[PDB]
């Protein structure tokens, strides 16, 4: 994680995929003043290992691209550090039912 202050050079933005095993995740420290997962409108995102991604897709009989999608540059997908093809689990409080578990894949 490379926390910076004003900017990283566009010449230096090419060094992010420069390591194919290892990732570099850059955050501007003005965007880190408030942890956005503590906000009332943001539910509990939990990321699923493939031992239960696969058991999710076996219950509902889903291809991976038929799930609801979360973006690669979402403020909570960048928080958890989601690679593409990783299902995150959302437990949100419905007005009707209370705690309601929903799922969403990163593509």
């Amino acid at each position: 994680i490379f926390v910076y202050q004003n900017n990283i050079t566009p010449s230096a933005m090419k060094l992010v995929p420069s390591i194919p095993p290892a990732t570099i995740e850059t955050f501007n420290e003005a965007a880190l003043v408030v942890n956005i997962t503590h906000h009332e409108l943001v539910p509990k995102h939990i990321r699923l290992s493939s031992d239960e991604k696969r058991e999710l897709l076996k219950r509902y009989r889903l291809k991976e691209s038929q799930l609801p999608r979360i973006q690669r540059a979402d403020p909570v997908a960048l928080y958890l550090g989601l690679k593409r093809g990783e299902v995150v689990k959302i437990i949100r409080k419905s007005e009707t039912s209370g705690r309601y578990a929903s799922y969403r894949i990163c593509m």
């Binding site: 956005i36 539910p43 291809k63 999608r69 403020p75 593409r84 689990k89 437990i91 009707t96 578990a101």
Partner: protein, 1542 residues
């Protein structure tokens, strides 16, 4: 139905006709003659007899006749390949991007190889592997770039073989919306890198860039003077835009497409290519046309005048030109002018096939000939007029009429309709007795028939026959015909519509599904109109004054079963929007139950037996006991009498089933107890074992009202018992009204003499109210008189302002509305002449029969304040509200307070003001119409295949999952009505136990499992009760997420679970608590949403229908439908009024919070200036600017702005703007000072189009304009007249290579007091202020008091007069003192329910995070959804959508369910972005017939062909086109018959 179909269409491939059309139709058309003299079809013409039979000639191809031939196609041999105007825009990309020398593209062959190899990955179900191709990257020699290509194709050959080894793809590929999202993102990028390059990267020699014109000519420019020097240092090792012939461009793009076959194999395919056919260039070029068959090109006709067709008119012009360009090619064959007509003939042979396909993309007199593209794209055309909107047989329409003597689930059919509409009834062994009588009666006498169908397929009409032939033909129905081909079939008598059929019945604006219900048929004699019950008038929303309803009569048993079980009126009792009942008795049945169930109502014995059999008749099947049972009387000894509440007991005793016990209900009336007298209890309704024991019945009980008696019988005994009670009470209070009438007279309206004495004296106290308010607003006192001249000066001051004078119109309105409610509160119950039961005027308001207490007050007491546009009566320029009043008359009556009443009359002055308030509602009559018409259509095209699956998930038609449960808990809205009404269920336990019968039910569903897991999750949640939501440990996901609710007993949402615990714990009441859980957890299981349910349509109708109810104006925040057009439609990144709710802390105080609002709210420098005194003098033009601020103790309270900040804005921002405005204005002085006199300027006041709305239809009154919208289906608007539709019409600009690339301009050619005695500081501050500005030359600032500022701009002497004060007033209103960005003004409103919050006019989340000492930053709430998406992610953007749709509905007191709002917000955020319902949102979708049928039809059509798409035929808009059965509901499964033999 006796002709079954086997094979059926399952999927539809798009494609291009190759020029081998010559196989299917070589009947080619060369003669441009259509008919000769003496009317024959000429051979080789456009009406040839090999194209199908025509004018009673036979077909030369079929051999069949005028009717039976299907028609045949024919081609027109173009001698040259002129291109296609559909695929032209998408070859002009491929022509600009190719190198003509190298015969490749301009890009690198490996950059093309990258995109060619990612699109191979996207056509399978794998996307992350298509981003891992960019991670293969290792002045480059040729042996490295051919190995880089080898290892990228190495990975893909393993990436596909890995996934196809699993089930993640098939050999036919996979294709979803998110897969189609990424493919559009590469191909649009691949068509942007290729469009802009300089040289070919595989050679040097580069082609000159083309430029086109209106789709007919291709021009190639001459390569300019700099670039040939590149062509001769690399290649060696006429005029502007010469013409390029159409055979050159094929020859160019043939060797381009042959060379890069590898990339184009994956641009023109979104699924894998399985035929491996080559993408060729003659797909873009048209060697031949085809001609539609003659049946599709018949002549047009008006009266006797039979004109020539549109299609033949265009198609002959091509065929004359083709013969010309053939004949003139013979002319040039013997060798100038002949070369200039041939090249001009190529312009017009292209231009006439461009005319054959398009109309606007050709040239036209005023309105040219329609092309085949423009026959498709509007509300009219083809794809919405004749594919979604067909006209039907077996239907009728008529005016409807009221009827209380029919059942509520019935329609009364006239005998005019009844002897026309016929149903094919196959004759069998059980119906020959009733179908012989049908053939005997014939088509005149009603229970008869019209025609019989033989076993061979032919019909035999019975119309002209007599009773001889008809009786001799009824006796032959069960006779087998001798044939063996038809030994299975039997005959079909087309009997008339009897009393046992059903009918779809259709009010014409069908805004929701209860506007089209299924009635039973009752054929009534002697009538000419359809005839309907009053209980159905709320469902269709009908008023019985000339409404026409369509009567659709379905024609098979798969539709009779579904109009009797699914779309009947008995199942439509509760609406799906909130679960409220929409069926009940309306006006005069309400006002008879208040008399019948009253306590005066005693009936004798002969009267008791008559009213029971007047409403309940055992022959029709109303009783359940086959014999009317009665009750003992309530009075025995003096004379036997029955009470009126005992008749209601009796009619409930007979219609309810005898096994189930009576209803137990405790409720309320609308009628207060004190209207009956001392100690009366006739407000509490009490049913105890099916017996009305207390309290009258009203609109609150058997109206369309929730938790009444009819709504309770629907829950305990079901929909058919509650249907019969509205039928029985509809006839009980009709026969009671006949025997005992009801009237409204003049004595019902008069006050008594004491009560009429009260309202004179209470209104005597309002003669001195208009001046007490007028002296309050002007801040005078001690009751200044009305004609005091200082008051009259002040009232004229508040006459000239609009933010004032609503102050006076809100003080004086409230100060006279108190006198209004003092007269009502003392008179209308107590000062009336006739008290409650006998006063039918009050009894129609208290019952809810018709009217209100407001209507009764304006009749008996006074009209009151007639308020206009929210304010009050408008005033003249002279201070007079009428010519009868003194100017500035301080009076209530002069301001429009009507003290008169409708009983006694309103005076001519106050008659006039009530005519003003009568008109201001009537301007909101015409603006109601086309508000929500387009909004609901745009919802119902996206939420249209969305349906419950059998695993309770909410999925779109293509399978792309939207939700995992409906609402969170999979409950139908029309079932959760008594689900939390636990007190009602405990009273009715034994009656509700054998509705939800658990004895024959428990061995099919698991009992012990989800009860065990729920008590884990319940107790574990009770541990971490005070932990916040982000610290909630997630060991135990909810029980619905693990167990099927319809299969496991006890798997229940965590909100129903807690309410059931909180009822059983706080209440101690032969019923245990174990057997009340096991019923209320069975009631939950039997109240679930069924699979196949069309929850997409229901959610889109439950939003769009009550938005026909919020069309009204202000009684700040964007209100109603234009707020709903921003959320649901158009996906507004820029809301016109964005806000931000900032919750302040608990320990911050109100003084600390108002001071905080001042710190955020922006302060213009205009806001702290009182006066600016500019003394201009000359000699150099020495302008002196003196500013007078307000006092420092004032603007430091009002704005929290220190006087040092005024120094730090004037000296550093103001004068930089001031001297910029001056040198701009002196530059205007030298350059532009005078126009050209005599030259006309353009137009003045016309609009952009049509110069008016309508020249004739704009003067149609609402009784005449509803006469033109009743006789035809005319609910649509052609131009829906919206700026957001115009902003949906205006966006998405052409190019960055346009005339202006970044909106570039010139930006060039610039090159009192008398004080002195400053200190050294202010002298030296001034020195660098002069030295850093251009004209200052003197400066000072009042630092001791902060009251003034002063400087002396001394300009040039050459300059002339200049309006300096208007320069200053602009700059002061723009100079910001203190603005936090994107935020204008904060304010501290009055709290709703303990939430101390702020409201911020603007959205800036990033800046409010640094104010955590006052604001809870973990609780701030916006309505800008595109800002919550950008900052807090996609789930907080989702919860903002459901919260901001709910503000639109709860403001109008409309309660939609949250289950409908959750399904829309999950559809708008299904991509992780904020998409709306529009063309741009619809783009990422699977089915193309949904896209073509919405709008921009041939836009999506060319997209579907260039994609070479297979249509999977699963959206419902694609199944109706191809005629396939829809699969939402009863089409969502297959029925299979069990046969016994092997």
């Amino acid at each position: 139905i006796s002709k079954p179909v086997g094979s059926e269409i399952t999927s539809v491939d798009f494609g291009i006709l190759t020029a081998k059309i010559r196989n299917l139709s070589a009947k080619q058309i060369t003669n441009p003659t259509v008919l000769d003299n003496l009317g024959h079809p000429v051979s080789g013409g456009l009406y040839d007899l090999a194209l199908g039979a025509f004018l009673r000639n036979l077909c030369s191809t079929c051999g069949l006749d005028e009717k039976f031939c299907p028609g045949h196609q024919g081609h027109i041999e173009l001698p040259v390949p002129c291109y296609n105007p559909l695929f032209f825009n998408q070859l002009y990309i491929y022509l600009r991007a190719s190198c003509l020398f190298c015969h490749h593209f301009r890009l690198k062959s490996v950059e093309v190889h990258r995109y060619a190899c990612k699109l191979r990955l996207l056509q399978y179900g794998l996307i992350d592997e298509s981003y891992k191709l960019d991670e293969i990257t290792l002045d480059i020699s040729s042996t490295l770039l051919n190995e880089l290509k080898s290892k990228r194709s190495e990975y893909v050959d393993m990436a596909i073989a890995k996934a196809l080894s699993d089930g993640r793809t098939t050999e036919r590929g996979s294709f979803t919306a998110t897969v189609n999202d990424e493919r559009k993102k590469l191909v649009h990028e691949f068509h942007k890198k290729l469009l802009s390059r300089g040289k070919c990267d595989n050679c040097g020699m580069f082609s000159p860039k083309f430029r086109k014109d209106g789709f007919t000519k291709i021009f190639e420019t001459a390569l300019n003077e700099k670039q040939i020097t590149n062509n001769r240092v690399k290649g060696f090792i006429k005029t502007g835009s010469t013409y390029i012939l159409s055979t050159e461009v094929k020859n160019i793009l043939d060797t381009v497409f042959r060379k890069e076959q590898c990339v184009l194999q994956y641009v023109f395919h979104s699924r894998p290519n399985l035929s491996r056919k080559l993408v060729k260039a003659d797909s873009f070029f048209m060697d031949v046309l085809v001609v539609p068959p003659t049946r599709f090109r018949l002549p047009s006709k008006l009266g006797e005048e039979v004109h020539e067709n549109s299609q033949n008119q265009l198609l002959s012009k091509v065929l004359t030109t083709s013969l010309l360009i053939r004949d003139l090619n013979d002319d040039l064959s013997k060798l100038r002018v002949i070369f200039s007509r041939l090249m001009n003939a190529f312009v017009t042979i292209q231009n006439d096939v461009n005319a054959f396909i398009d109309s606007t993309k050709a040239q036209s007199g005023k309105v040219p000939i329609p092309g085949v593209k423009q026959a498709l794209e509007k509300k009219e055309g083809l794809f919405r007029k004749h594919m979604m909107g067909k006209r039907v047989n077996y239907a009728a329409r008529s005016v409807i009429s009221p009827d209380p003597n029919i059942e509520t689930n019935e329609i009364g059919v006239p005998p005019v309709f009844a002897v026309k509409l016929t149903y094919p009834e196959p004759v069998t062994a059980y119906n020959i007795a009733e179908l012989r009588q049908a053939v005997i009666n014939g088509p005149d006498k009603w229970p008869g028939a019209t025609q019989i169908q033989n076993e061979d397929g032919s019909l035999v009409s019975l119309i002209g026959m007599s009773v001889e032939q008809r009786k001799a033909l009824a006796n032959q129905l069960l006779t087998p015909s001798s044939n063996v081909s038809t030994h299975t079939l039997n005959k079909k008598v087309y009997r008339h519509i009897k009393n046992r059929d059903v009918v779809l019945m259709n009010r014409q604006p069908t805004l929701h599904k209860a506007s089209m219900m299924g009635h039973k048929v009752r054929v009534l004699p002697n009538e000419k109109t359809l005839r309907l019950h009053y209980a159905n008038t709320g469902a269709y929303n009908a008023d019985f004054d000339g409404d026409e309803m369509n009567m659709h009569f379905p024609q098979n048993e798969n539709a009779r079963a579904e109009a009797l079980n699914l779309a009947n009126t008995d199942s439509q009792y509760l609406t799906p929007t909130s679960g409220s009942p929409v069926r009940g008795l309306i006006q005069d049945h309400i006002s008879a139950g208040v008399w019948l169930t009253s306590k005066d109502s005693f009936f004798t014995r002969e009267q008791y037996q008559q009213y029971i059999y007047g409403c309940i008749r055992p022959e029709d099947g109303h009783t359940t006991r086959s014999k009317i049972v009665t009750l003992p009387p309530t009075i025995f000894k003096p004379y036997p009498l029955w009470t009126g509440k005992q008749i209601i007991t009796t009619v409930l005793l007979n219609v309810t089933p005898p096994d189930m016990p009576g209803i137990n209900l405790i409720s309320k009336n609308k009628i207060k107890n004190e209207y009956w007298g001392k100690g009366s209890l006739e407000n509490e309704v009490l049913f105890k074992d099916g017996a009305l024991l207390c309290g009258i019945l009203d609109k609150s009980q058997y109206g369309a009202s929730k938790y009444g008696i009819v709504h309770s019988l629907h829950e305990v005994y079901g929909p058919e018992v509650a249907a019969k009670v509205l039928s029985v009470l509809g006839r009980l209070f009709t026969n009671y009204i006949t025997a005992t009438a009801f009237t409204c007279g003049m004595d019902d309206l008069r006050l008594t003499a004491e009560g009429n004495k009260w309202r004179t004296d209470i209104l005597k106290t309002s003669v001195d109210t208009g001046r007490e308010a007028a002296a309050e607003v002007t801040n005078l006192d001690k009751d200044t008189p009305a004609d005091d001249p200082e008051l009259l000066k002040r009232l004229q001051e508040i006459l000239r302002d609009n933010n004032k004078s609503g102050i006076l119109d809100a003080v004086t309105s409230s100060k006279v509305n108190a006198i209004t409610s003092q007269v009502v509160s003392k008179c209308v119950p107590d000062g009336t002449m006739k008290k409650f039961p006998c006063n039918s005027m009050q009894a129609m308001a208290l019952s809810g029969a018709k009217g209100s207490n407001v209507n009764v007050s304006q009749i008996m007491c006074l009209l009151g304040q007639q308020a206009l546009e929210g304010r009050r009566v408008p005033v003249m320029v002279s201070g007079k509200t009428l010519p009868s009043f003194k100017p500035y008359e301080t009076d209530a009556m002069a301001g429009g307070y009507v003290k008169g009443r409708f009983y006694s009359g309103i005076k001519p002055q106050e008659y006039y003001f009530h005519c003003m308030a009568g008109r201001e509602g009537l301007i909101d009559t015409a603006v109601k119409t086309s508000r929500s018409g387009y909004l609901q259509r745009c919802l119902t095209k996206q939420l249209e295949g969305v349906h419950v699956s059998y695993d309770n998930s909410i999925r779109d038609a293509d399978g792309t999952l939207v939700q995992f449960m409906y609402g969170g808990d999979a409950i139908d809205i029309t079932k959760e009505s008594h689900m939390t009404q636990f007190e009602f269920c405990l009273d009715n336990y034994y009656a509700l136990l054998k509705k939800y019968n658990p004895s024959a039910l428990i061995e099919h569903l698991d009992v012990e499992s989800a009860l065990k897991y729920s008590k884990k999750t319940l107790k574990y949640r009770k541990k971490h009760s005070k932990e916040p939501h982000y610290k909630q440990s997630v060991k135990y996901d909810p029980v619905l997420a693990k167990y099927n609710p319809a299969k496991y007993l006890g798997s229940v949402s965590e909100n129903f679970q807690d309410k059931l615990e909180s009822f059983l714990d706080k209440n101690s009441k032969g019923v245990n608590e174990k057997k009340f859980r096991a019923l209320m957890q069975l009631k939950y299981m039997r109240s679930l949403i069924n699979p196949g349910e069309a929850v997409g349509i229901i959610a889109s109708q439950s939003v769009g229908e009550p938005s026909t109810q919020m069309t009204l104006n202000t009684f700040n925040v964007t209100l109603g439908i234009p707020r709903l057009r921003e959320i649901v439609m158009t996906a507004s990144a820029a809301i016109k009024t964005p806000q931000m709710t900032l919750p302040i802390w608990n320990d911050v105080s109100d003084e600390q919070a108002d001071t905080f609002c001042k710190s955020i709210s922006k302060v213009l420098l205009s806001e702290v200036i009182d006066k600016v005194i500019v003394t201009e003098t000359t000699g150099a033009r020495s302008y002196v600017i003196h500013m007078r601020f307000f006092d420092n103790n004032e603007y430091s309270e009002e704005y929290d702005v220190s006087k040092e900040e005024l120094q730090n804005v004037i000296s550093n921002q103001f004068i930089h703007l001031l001297e910029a405005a001056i040198v701009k204005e002196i530059k205007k002085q030298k350059r532009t000072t005078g126009p050209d006199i005599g030259v006309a300027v353009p137009r003045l006041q016309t609009d952009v189009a049509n110069s008016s709305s309508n020249s004739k239809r704009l003067e149609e009154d609402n009784d005449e304009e509803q006469s033109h919208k009743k006789t035809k289906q005319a609910v649509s608007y052609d131009e829906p007249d919206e700026d957001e539709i115009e902003t949906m019409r205006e966006a998405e600009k052409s190019s960055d290579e346009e005339g202006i690339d970044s909106d570039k301009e010139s930006d060039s050619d610039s090159e009192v007091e008398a004080n002195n005695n400053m200190n050294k500081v202010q002298r030296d501050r001034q020195s660098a202020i002069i030295s850093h500005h251009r004209f200052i030359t003197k400066y000072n600032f009042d630092d001791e008091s902060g009251k003034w500022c002063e400087f002396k701009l001394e300009l040039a002497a050459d300059t002339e007069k200049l309006l300096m004060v208007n320069i200053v007033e602009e700059i002061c209103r723009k100079s910001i003192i203190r603005q936090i960005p994107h935020i204008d003004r904060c304010v501290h409103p009055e709290p709703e329910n303990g939430k101390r919050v702020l409201v911020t006019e603007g959205v800036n989340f990033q800046a409010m995070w640094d104010q955590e000492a006052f604001i809870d930053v973990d609780g701030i709430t916006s309505n800008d959804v595109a800002a919550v998406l950008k900052t807090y992610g996609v789930e907080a953007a989702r919860n903002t959508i459901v919260n901001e749709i709910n503000n639109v509905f709860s403001r109008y007191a409309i309660s939609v369910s949250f289950r409908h709002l959750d399904l829309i917000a999950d559809m708008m955020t299904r991509q992780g972005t904020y998409l709306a319902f529009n063309r741009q949102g619809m783009e990422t979708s699977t089915s193309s017939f949904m896209k073509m049928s919405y709008e921009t039809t041939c836009q999506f059509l060319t997209k579907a062909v260039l994609d070479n798409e297979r249509e999977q035929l699963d959206s419902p808009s694609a199944r109706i086109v191809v005629g396939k059965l829809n699969n939402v509901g009863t089409g969502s499964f297959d029925v299979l018959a069990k046969v016994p033999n092997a």
